[PDB]
């Protein structure tokens, strides 16, 4: 639904996290492509880093797994996309 | 808990979205600081753009508002952080 993962200077790949015991069952996790960021000339620059952006989200689990009568609402951490950080702040 | 919002080349500000009718009540929404990205010299470069990274999340609402006996679990879209995108892909 979005192509930022490919257009970003800190680009990422989506990894399917499949678990039938939780809702949502599939979560697509961002994994950064490079350690550095794509600079103004299309090259990986190591004067900066690609870092994942994490968000705490609520999920519903079948707790204990497979069981029908019980469930548990809990917060988990998920990688959403990557950003580019530098050691020099201006 | 994280200072990427300040170290990113696509930096952002957190805006409190306060609603006592939903859980979580406070959601901190990323709003990009600039249209462009901070380049290798500390300047805002407009050969690229800062864009928010959105994630669909589950929230619980008092539906209808203030009422005690009923509730509704629904998915909403939230801005998590910003990334830097370029018109040229390499």
């Amino acid at each position, epitope marked *: 639904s979005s192509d930022y993962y490919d257009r970003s200077t800190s680009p990422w790949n989506l990894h399917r996290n499949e678990d039938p015991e939780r809702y949502p069952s599939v979560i697509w996790e961002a994994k950064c492509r490079h350690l550095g960021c794509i600079n103004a000339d299309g090259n990986v620059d*190591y004067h900066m880093n690609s870092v994942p952006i994490q968000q705490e989200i609520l999920v519903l689990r079948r707790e204990p797994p497979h069981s029908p009568n019980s469930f548990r609402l809990e917060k988990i951490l998920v990688s959403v996309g990557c950003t580019c950080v530098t050691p020099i702040v201006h | 808990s*994280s200072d990427y919002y300040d170290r990113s080349t696509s930096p952002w500000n957190l805006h409190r979205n306060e609603d006592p009718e939903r859980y979580p009540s406070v959601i901190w929404e990323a709003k990009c600081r600039h249209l462009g990205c901070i380049n290798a010299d500390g300047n805002v470069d407009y050969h690229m753009n800062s864009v928010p990274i959105q994630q669909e999340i589950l929230v619980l609402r008092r539906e209808p508002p203030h009422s005690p006996n009923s509730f509704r679990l629904e998915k909403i879209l939230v801005s998590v952080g910003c990334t830097c995108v370029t018109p040229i892909v390499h």
Partner: antibody, heavy 121, light 111 residues
Framework: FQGEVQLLESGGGLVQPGGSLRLSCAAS????????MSWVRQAPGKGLEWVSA????????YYADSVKGRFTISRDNSKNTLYLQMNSLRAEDTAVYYC???????????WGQGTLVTVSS | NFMLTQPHSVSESPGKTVTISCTRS????????VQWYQQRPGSSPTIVIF?????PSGVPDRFSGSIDSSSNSASLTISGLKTEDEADYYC?????????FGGGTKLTVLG
């Protein structure tokens, strides 16, 4: 500001060749989860030698050739603590081990106090 | 992996200027930020220069970093030299996987 980043190592001690030891580094004064962390050592009377590194999330790990397959860097971002699990320890591993905060991978900005590891029979 | 080579010893009188070179073998030095540390006897290293030429809040203008690609080397210069500057100095840089420290330079203030 100068002095707010605090890094405190523990866990050094005497171990025999082939032995195991775990180093801990308690951090404060900064948002721990958004920083890459490093382990650096110094054998007595010698220079600094980089051992290992880990990204803010813990999703990426790096090791010097000399410790690869024997050491494991990890972190608990909820406890603001950095770890180093050292297995099959050898006489060459004898050093003061320092905890380090990195601005980006390879840019070390702050150092701990150090903890002494002695590998001897 | 790669290595950084710096002199073993550097000497100068007070008020004068010293320079510590740090030469990189494998890889281009200009592609990775170079750091400089000061180490006093029995003490943890302290940062003098980060990101080639940045000074932490509290490090005097006497200390300054520079890089030179035509030689694949970084330099630390100490003008207006004082007796407190006597210590061990280390250069540090990285590649996409490794982090490497130079062998260290021992500073001696003559006089």
């Amino acid at each position: 500001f100068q002095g707010e980043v605090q890094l405190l190592e523990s866990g050094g001690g005497l171990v025999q060749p082939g032995g195991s030891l775990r180093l801990s580094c308690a951090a404060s004064g900064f948002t721990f989860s958004s920083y890459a962390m490093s382990w650096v050592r110094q054998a007595p009377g010698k220079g600094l030698e980089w051992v290992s590194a880990i990204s803010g999330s813990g999703g990426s790990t790096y090791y010097a050739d000399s410790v690869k397959g024997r050491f494991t860097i990890s972190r608990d971002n909820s406890k603001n603590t950095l770890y180093l699990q050292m297995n099959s320890l050898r006489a060459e591993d004898t050093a003061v081990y320092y905890c380090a905060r990195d601005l980006i991978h390879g840019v070390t900005r702050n150092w701990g106090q150090g903890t002494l590891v002695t590998v001897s029979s | 992996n790669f290595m950084l080579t710096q002199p073993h010893s550097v000497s100068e009188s007070p008020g004068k200027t010293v320079t510590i070179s740090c030469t990189r073998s494998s890889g281009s030095l200009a592609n990775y930020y170079v750091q400089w540390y000061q180490q006093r006897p029995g003490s943890s290293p302290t940062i003098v220069i980060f990101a080639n030429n940045q000074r932490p809040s509290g490090v005097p203008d006497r200390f300054s970093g520079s890089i030179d690609s035509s030689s694949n080397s970084a330099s630390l210069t100490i003008s207006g030299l004082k007796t407190e500057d006597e210590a061990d100095y280390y250069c540090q840089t990285y590649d996409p996987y490794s982090v490497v420290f130079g062998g260290g330079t021992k500073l001696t203030v003559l006089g």
